[PDB]
Symmetry: C3
Subunit: 138 residues, 3 copies
């Protein structure tokens, strides 16, 4: 995590070269995670059909520790959809995105697991309060 996987029958050659970089930047901001650990895995030219039909489609997954809830999921879904519509020429009704909560102690980075506090976004909340105190001095 965070890992954005895009499974699409749209041909690799036909996808803008900056698509993964743009999706990296967008989801870095949306998930409030360090850019350094944001993966984008583009499986383009996939043998994926939807509704028994080979028109352009996307099944995408977002794997993340914390950050995922009904409100953030819908907002991120619509922005991811918009990028797929614009850059892959895929219709909104051919896009399904799964949001996958990852437990902090069920995910390694760089020789260690993650802090459990991230699952409840306490990393953000505690930094948000500290920054508020710096700007208001209280």
């Amino acid at each position: 995590m965070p890992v954005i996987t895009v499974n699409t029958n749209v041909a690799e050659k036909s996808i803008p070269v900056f698509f993964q970089a743009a999706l990296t930047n967008m989801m870095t901001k949306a998930l409030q995670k360090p850019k350094e650990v944001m993966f984008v895995d583009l499986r383009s030219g996939a043998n994926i059909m939807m509704g028994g039909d080979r028109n352009p489609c996307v099944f995408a997954t977002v794997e993340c520790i914390g950050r995922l809830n009904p409100t953030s999921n819908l907002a991120m879904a619509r922005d991811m959809e918009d990028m797929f519509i614009e850059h892959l020429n895929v219709r909104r009704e051919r896009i399904v995105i799964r949001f996958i909560p990852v437990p902090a102690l069920f995910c390694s980075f760089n020789g260690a697991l993650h802090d459990v506090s991230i699952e409840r976004d306490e990393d953000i909340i505690s930094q948000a309060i500290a920054e508020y105190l710096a700007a208001h001095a209280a």
Copy 2:
């Protein structure tokens, strides 16, 4: 969801052309979902080995909101196995399937999330009761 992913070292050119369409129809019926949102993602010619050996194998996943339980999982597993044996020429002892429950509010389709009632199959249970009443002379 519903997304059926098939990971197999069986060569793409060896797979019947209608395999994905047939798996779509079968799992549409089995999962009682609209055909329109049924994905089949075939990863054929995959660099997948099983038991350290490159004999034909399948690792498949079924991602679905509701519908998955110990009873439906076993029945769907045996039918998916039968389709892999017949169409991919893979032995039953080289097939593993994972059934993945998806939360309604953790899955988008067409600009919206899904109804939480689907997670508990309330859509099926409520339609089953309504159809029972229609067929057995109960219209009020």
Copy 3:
């Protein structure tokens, strides 16, 4: 399960031929499962970037019934990392591994589901206790 999935932008031609066999043997021992049902799915030459950058990286998953807990996950992560560094020439800070608990009744092998006692490692724990009692002279007549 157990399924080890390796997603790496490292080119297939650059990966030692025995990488999957070595990962199979290592994780068979680590997860205390039959070798027969250990899958290794290598997606090499993947179009996967990390931090907006195309330096060598690995996103791997371990799908397993039982066996996964904070203690086993860290130990397996470091050994998997060591094998990826050696075989894929990737830096530790370009490796993320997700450990995925699989329910026994949500996974088929060879026409049947899995017991359910396996989820809580009761197969290992009950065999460990029975072998301890064998070696320390306890009978069951």
